[PDB]
UniProtKB/TrEMBL annotation, chain B:
GO terms for cellular component: chromosome, telomeric region; RNA polymerase II, core complex. The keyword Zinc-finger applies. It is found in: Nucleus. Zn(2+) 2 binds at residues 1076, 1079, 1094-1095, 1097. NCBIfam families: PRK09606.1 (NF007175). Zn(2+) 3 binds at residues 1077-1078. Zn(2+) 1 binds at residues 1076, 1079. This is DNA-directed RNA polymerase subunit beta.
Length: 117, 1131, 101, 101
């Protein structure tokens, strides 16, 4: 499914709101400030992930490998670069109950690969 | 090169000693005051606007320079003389220096007829001076010079003398400013709230708090609002953004959402956009803001102007208050919204209110600056009125007469004298407890009072969260020293190496960031903020950077080289969120730490070598800091630091814990404060015991100060024979406990002997007490002055006479001299007269107003001092001396929370004795140990036995693996004693051996201020209060004890109705009234003529006598005052 | 009803200056504004002037029997301390009922 | 107590103009298996669809089935809110709502 992003008008740079064209029976995205209209390409207007199945690997950034206060391990080598050392840490993010899961990051500079066991 | 472990315990303590040679214990007070005088006063004077006044001629009156001379005093003749602090203490003067300001008045009328007249050094006020500060006459003086001036060289200073009273400013905690803090209140309409107490760099107004909240779920989604200042209605964030000139939704989300690949943030901001679509232009948004405000202008023009002024001045002043700053303010408000969304999306943690990285300590300097801003503003106002009333007449005026200097002088003096921190008129809005009377009971109490912090949460509050010992207090606040009463956790104390930052300007840092590859916030495009790292300086988002790591490396190198970045500047890199926050402002508590290389200290052996010869090569602490070997780390930068508790942690281990440390503790024992640093083996006690000792070291007797012979303190206790502890910690070398100790090493036996030490009591040796054991002298000072306020009535010191004086007690006045003052060396008993003062009447033409002794004292007059007070009438101080020999009921304590009163005193033949005839000085009960778990008491006793038998001083420093109980026992077994400190004792009464071998040895005991003779009190028909005819309150008033509500309830449960009536009616306030039997209202009785009548009912026969408490009669009359008719109906 | 002198004793200080009770100062204000209103009704005064005088008299009486009225300003005295009205004299702890009876 | 959120995995609104050719590809089987016979007023159909995805774990933890859920929806909102659903056999527990007019 995936989320749906906001899209803005091409004239007033205000957000385009959803609207339906009965004549063609087709979804349109129209600005309620100017008189711009656009043919939608997703057909989906709203998405709620109640389960919150978020891949926290996307929230991690490689720069965290520079943190002296994070633990490092030599037991989980990097699959992308083969570096031995890697920092690991827990989710520590709200809305995540099973947050004892460990996320690893490669400490090699300019690799910054992140993964999970 | 490397310091090996075997040398480490020396090296670290050498380093610590260097610190205390450089800084001291009251460095925060002195540095705060010095910054206030050097910088804050000048900034406050210059930041005031020039007062332009005109009817025509006009005058600006610009203040340009300040001059603070040394402290001086002006006599009645007016001769300025340098005033010494001891003279201020004795004469009840205020140790203040005059502040002169240069004023420039230029006349501008017309025709370019301009001429400037400059008044150099216009006396603008008097500022009280902190002792031992740069502007103190005791500055830079040697110990010989201080002793020549009758000053103690060990006196730390750090306090003011206002009217002879030593006042100490307590550091006040407050939430840090210019920082966004996202909290979540459980019981509120908002789910999340992001607040920012914003305040411009150079303070001129209070903190303007801005909130950016999210409405709790349950229209369609979660709406973001903004509670702007001076506006009593929530305002949508989009409206605020449009009012700042950002009308397009794309621009607003460019400022709020920096990563457009994230639809979660987008949908969570979408409700706010959907709620603000009808408003789409800047003027309409400003009109909406003005309309939602509490002063809605009928015309939209003034509404828009008011909204403009609010959004330019009151909204986020720290971002900038000038015009054209809307871009910076928009970026910052978008950052606030971003932080709120990150909290609501769970991507960031809510901020902790208790984190000391989020707090600031308002010290003497920044507090006096708040006072000085208010007082200088009031002064400029008064000058404006005075000059206006003259130029309205079209003539010149004298600014010297316009400047009524009493504003600044009396304001600072009043505020420091009372503690009510604020204007004297706003005596209830003002916050008390600042500026307390310095505690001079013992040197530890003085040091701790000078290192005292205060959390103004309010003692009434019963939420334990602010009282809890937060994790972040480590190294900054003593974990132990805190009052155990109603202010647990609120009143705190600095740790020994804790330094509160004094403040610095961010200008050099910002300039270097400009020269460095940082990009300003107005020059960037928002698309760059995604991957870039934000840079905040004192809360202001100033720009962004691309490689934060090597930026942090550069900045840390700069701070460690004492380059443009000064040592107290905090530089935190948050990595997961890409902020780099730099702080230079004041109030940041920090502590020094040893920097660590790859896995090594930078403190090599050469630094220890140069520190050992500190007194020859002038290699000091500052050279250690300048070498890049030591660093001050604040609470907020500790979050990014990986500490080593000892260099042993830097060793490569079979399983490495960290292997990437960045700093090291100089010594862990520096987490303790002044009073906890006296506890020996505090890590072998239960922590409440350490807290109780930290409180009780402050009531311990000793020698509170070396120059006690010249001080006329109201109360002072000096111990005859203070001793340094046989078992000491390495921190007391800097507390000067060895030079001014507060106890005696007592041979204490923990035993059950006769039962007179049960339940926290002690048996003392009467023979030891006869030899001066724990004997003290109590000095009490009485002050008096003869006031010639007016010719109507004048007081005068003179030996009263029975024929002229009226209110002359039956006590004899023969001890007085013809001057009316008793002489030193005269033995004075209770109720005796020490000053004969008589006041002229309007037993004729003069009444007796003599000063008696505080009753039941029985001392000897130590000395009498006569001088003139500020206004200049005769002023007397009499110090009376009373020897306090310890007795049954006097409170004693060890350094482990083991307090108790003397149960009984036995002579040396009555006490138990060892085979070599050693009797204990004190016997304490074994039952005081097990529940309390004060094993430090036992280890100190054993170590003290070893120390006394070996001829050394035991090392009881808290965390010392080179000293454990087995080593001490092995040492003690070498001196012919049982290795565990037990001995066979013999019964003193019978001489038989005691079956159980007793644990006996030297322990450092303290005699506490709480002597029974100052507490014993009795009453039998004494004086009564005026309003309700009940016994007075207090020993000093010869008052009665309160039979309270709980006593009433207890006696009701007992069923003792006559005893209850005796206590609540007959022993307190018996009274009689006459009541009308018809209306039940108190009648008029005339018992001499026997005529009783009720004016109400117009009867004089149906009156009844009623025996009621006087308080009940007073209650009924105060109800009749309220139009209530309490009718006592006797039928 | 103005209470007797026992309810509001004039305590003499160390000298001859007789300090009056808070109730006495408040009654002084009440008598001042009462006389002022009496003359303003008897002699020339505007209706709004009499209204302001009546409002101030109301404020004085209310703050005599109860000083902590929400919103209204507290009845002040020298040194900037609010006066102790009859209600605070017996409101709670350390009042007449709990503190003296 | 169990609300639809406690057992729901994720909700979404689509613009499906004709249910015969749905926007999603994996929901084309059961939608046509439902639509080949007229069960409701197809004319009174709105192109706005509301697809909710359940999760097998919470469905099983409460012994709940799409039948009970659909009955509860059609009871709370009557016939004004049409709901359809597949069997409890597919790998994804999904049910589709539309608004009736
Ligand atoms: Zn548009
Ligand atoms: Zn890698
Ligand atoms: Zn009557």
């Amino acid at each position: 499914p995936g989320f749906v992003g906001i899209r803005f008008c091409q004239e007033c740079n205000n957000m385009l709101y959803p609207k339906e064209d009965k004549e063609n029976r087709i979804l349109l995205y129209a600005c309620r400030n100017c008189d711009y209209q656009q043919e939608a390409d997703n057909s989906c207007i709203y998405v709620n992930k109640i389960t919150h199945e978020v891949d926290e690997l996307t929230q991690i950034i490689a720069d965290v490998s520079q943190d002296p206060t994070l633990p490092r391990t030599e037991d989980h080598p990097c699959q992308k670069c083969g570096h031995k050392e890697a920092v690991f840490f827990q989710s520590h993010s709200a809305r995540a109950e099973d947050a004892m899961r460990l996320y690893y990051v490669c400490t090699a500079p300019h690799c910054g690969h992140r993964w999970t066991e | 090169d490397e310091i090996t472990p075997d040398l480490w315990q020396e090296a670290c303590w050498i380093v610590i000693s260097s610190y205390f040679d450089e800084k001291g214990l009251v460095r925060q007070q002195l540095d705060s005051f010095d910054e206030f005088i050097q910088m804050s006063v000048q900034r406050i004077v210059e930041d005031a606007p020039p007062i332009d006044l005109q009817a025509p001629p006009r005058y600006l009156l610009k203040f340009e320079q300040i001059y603070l001379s040394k402290p001086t005093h002006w006599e009645r003749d007016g001769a300025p003389s340098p005033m010494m602090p001891n003279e201020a203490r004795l004469r009840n003067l205020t140790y203040s220096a005059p502040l002169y300001v240069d004023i420039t008045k230029t006349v501008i009328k017309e025709g370019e007829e301009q001429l400037q007249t400059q008044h150099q050094k216009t006396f603008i006020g008097k500022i009280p001076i902190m002792l031992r500060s740069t502007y103190c006459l005791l500055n830079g003086l040697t110990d010989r010079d201080l002793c020549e001036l009758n000053e103690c060289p060990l006196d730390p200073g750090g306090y003011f003398i206002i009217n002879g009273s030593e006042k100490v400013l307590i550091a006040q905690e407050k939430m840090a400013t210019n920082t966004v803090y996202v909290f979540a209140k459980k019981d509120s309409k908002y789910a999340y709230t992001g607040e920012c107490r914003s305040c411009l760099e150079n303070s001129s107004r209070p903190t303007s708090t801005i909130w950016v909240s999210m409405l709790a779920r349950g229209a369609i989604g979660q709406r973001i609002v903004a509670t702007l200042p001076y506006i009593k209605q929530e305002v949508p964030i989009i409206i605020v953004f449009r009012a700042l000139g950002f009308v397009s939704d794309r621009d607003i989300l460019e400022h709020i959402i920096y990563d457009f690949e994230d639809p979660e943030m987008m949908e969570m901001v979408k409700p706010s956009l959907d709620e603000a679509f009808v408003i789409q232009e800047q003027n309409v948004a400003l009109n909406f803001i003005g309309s939602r405000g509490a002063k809605p202008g009928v015309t939209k023009e003034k509404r828009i102007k008011y909204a403009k002024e609010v959004l330019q001045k009151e909204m986020l002043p720290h971002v900038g208050v000038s015009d054209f700053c809307e871009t910076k303010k928009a970026y910052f408000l978008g950052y606030m919204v971003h932080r709120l969304l990150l909290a609501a999306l769970g991507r960031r943690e809510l901020d902790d209110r208790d984190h000391y990285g989020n707090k600031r300590l308002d010290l003497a300097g920044p507090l006096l600056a708040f006072l000085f801003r208010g007082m200088f503003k009031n002064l400029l106002k008064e000058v404006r009125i005075y000059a206006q009333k003259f130029i309205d007449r079209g003539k010149d005026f004298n600014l010297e007469l316009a400047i009524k200097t009493r504003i600044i002088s009396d304001g600072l003096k009043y505020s420091l004298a009372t503690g009510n921190w604020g204007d004297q008129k706003k005596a209830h809005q003002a916050r008390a407890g600042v500026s307390q009377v310095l505690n001079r009971l013992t040197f530890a109490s003085t040091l701790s009072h000078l290192r005292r912090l205060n959390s103004p949460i309010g003692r009434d509050g019963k939420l334990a969260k602010p009282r809890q010992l937060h994790n972040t207090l480590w190294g900054m606040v003593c974990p132990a020293e805190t009052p155990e009463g109603h202010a647990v956790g609120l009143v705190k104390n600095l740790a020994l190496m804790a330094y509160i930052s004094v403040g610095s300007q961010p200008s050099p840092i910002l300039e270097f960031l400009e020269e460095w590859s940082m990009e300003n916030l107005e020059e960037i495009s928002p698309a760059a903020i995604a991957d870039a790292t934000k840079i905040f300086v004192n809360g202001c988002w100033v720009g962004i950077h691309k490689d934060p790591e090597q930026l942090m490396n550069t900045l840390r190198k700069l701070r460690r080289q004492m380059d443009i970045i000064v040592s107290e500047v905090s530089m935190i890199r948050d990595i997961r969120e890409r902020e780099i926050r730099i702080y230079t402002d004041a109030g940041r508590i920090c502590r020094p730490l040893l920097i660590v290389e790859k896995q090594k200290l930078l403190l090599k052996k050469r630094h220890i070598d140069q520190l050992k010869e500190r007194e020859y090569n002038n290699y000091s602490w500052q050279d250690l800091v300048a070498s890049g070997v030591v660093e001050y780390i604040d609470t907020l930068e500790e979050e990014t630091v990986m500490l080593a508790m000892t260099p042993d942690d830097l060793q490569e281990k079979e399983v490495a814990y960290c292997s990437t440390y960045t700093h090291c503790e100089i010594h862990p024992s520096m987490i303790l404060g002044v009073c906890a640093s006296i506890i020996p083996f505090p890590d072998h006690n239960q922590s409440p015991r350490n807290t109780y000792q930290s409180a009780m070291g402050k009531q311990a007797m000793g020698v509170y100060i070396t120059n006690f012979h010249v001080r006329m303190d109201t109360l002072a206790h000096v111990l005859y024979y203070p001793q340094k502890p046989l078992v000491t910690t390495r921190s007391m070398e800097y507390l000067r406990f060895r030079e001014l100790p507060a106890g005696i090493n007592s041979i204490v036996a923990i035993a059950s002997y006769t039962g007179y030490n049960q339940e926290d009591s002690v048996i003392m040796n009467r023979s030891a007490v006869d030899r001066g054991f724990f004997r003290s002298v109590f000095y009490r000072s009485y002050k008096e002055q003869e006031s010639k306020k007016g010719f109507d009535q004048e007081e005068v010191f003179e030996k009263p006479t029975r024929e002229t004086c009226q209110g002359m007690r039956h006590a004899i006045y023969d001890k007085l001299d013809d001057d009316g003052l008793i002489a030193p060396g005269v033995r004075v008993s209770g109720d005796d007269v020490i000053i004969g003062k008589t006041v002229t009447l309007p037993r004729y033409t003069k009444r007796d107003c003599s000063t008696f002794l505080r009753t039941s004292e029985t001392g000897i007059v130590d000395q009498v001092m006569v001088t003139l007070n500020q206004e200049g009438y005769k002023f007397c101080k009499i110090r009376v001396r009373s020897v306090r020999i310890p007795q049954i009921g006097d409170k004693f304590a060890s350094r482990h929370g083991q307090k108790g009163t003397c149960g009984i005193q036995y002579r040396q033949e009555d006490m138990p004795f060892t085979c070599e005839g050693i009797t204990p000085d004190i016997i304490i009960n074994p039952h005081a140990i097990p529940s309390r778990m004060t094993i430090g008491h036992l280890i100190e006793c054993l170590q003290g036995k070893v120390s006394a038998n070996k001829g050394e001083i035991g090392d009881a420093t808290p965390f010392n693996d080179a000293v454990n109980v087995q080593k001490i026992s092995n040492l003690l077994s070498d001196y012919g004693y049982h290795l565990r400190g037990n001995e066979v004792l013999y019964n003193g009464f019978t001489g038989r051996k005691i079956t159980s071998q007793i644990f006996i040895g030297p322990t450092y005991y303290q005699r506490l201020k709480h002597m029974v003779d100052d507490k014993i009190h009795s009453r039998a028909r004494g004086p009564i209060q005026i309003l309700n005819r009940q016994p007075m309150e207090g020993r000093s008033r010869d008052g009665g004890l309160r039979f309270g509500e709980m006593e009433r309830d207890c006696q009701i449960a007992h069923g003792a109705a006559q005893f209850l009536r005796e206590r609540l009616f007959e022993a307190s306030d018996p009274y009689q009234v006459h009541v009308c039997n018809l209306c039940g209202i108190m009648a008029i009785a005339n018992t001499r003529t026997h005529t009783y009548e009720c004016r109400g009912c117009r009867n004089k026969t149906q009156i009844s006598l009623v025996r009621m408490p006087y308080a009940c009669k007073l209650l009924f009359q105060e109800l009749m005052s309220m139009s209530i008719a309490p009718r006592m109906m006797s039928v | 009803p103005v209470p007797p002198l026992s309810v509001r004793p004039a305590v003499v200080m160390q000298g001859s200056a007789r300090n009056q009770d808070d109730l006495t100062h408040k009654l002084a204000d009440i008598v001042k504004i009462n006389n002022q209103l009496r003359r303003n009704e008897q002699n020339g005064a505007a209706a709004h002037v009499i209204a302001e005088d009546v409002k101030l008299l109301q404020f004085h009486v209310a703050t005599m029997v109860d000083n902590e009225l929400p919103g209204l300003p507290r009845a002040m005295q020298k040194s900037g301390r609010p006066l102790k009205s009859l209600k605070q004299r017996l409101k709670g702890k350390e009042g007449r009922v709990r503190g003296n009876l | 107590h169990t609300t639809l959120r406690k057992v729901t995995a994720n909700t979404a609104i689509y613009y499906d103009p004709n249910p015969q050719s749905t926007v999603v590809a994996e929901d084309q089987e059961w939608v046509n298996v439902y639509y080949e016979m007229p069960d409701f007023d197809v004319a009174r159909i709105s192109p706005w669809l509301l697809r909710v995805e359940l999760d097998r774990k919470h469905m099983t933890d409460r012994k709940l089935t799409m039948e009970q859920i659909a009955e509860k929806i059609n009871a709370g909102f009557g016939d004004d809110l049409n709901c359809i659903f597949n069997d409890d056999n597919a790998e994804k527990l999904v049910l589709r709502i539309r608004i009736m007019n």
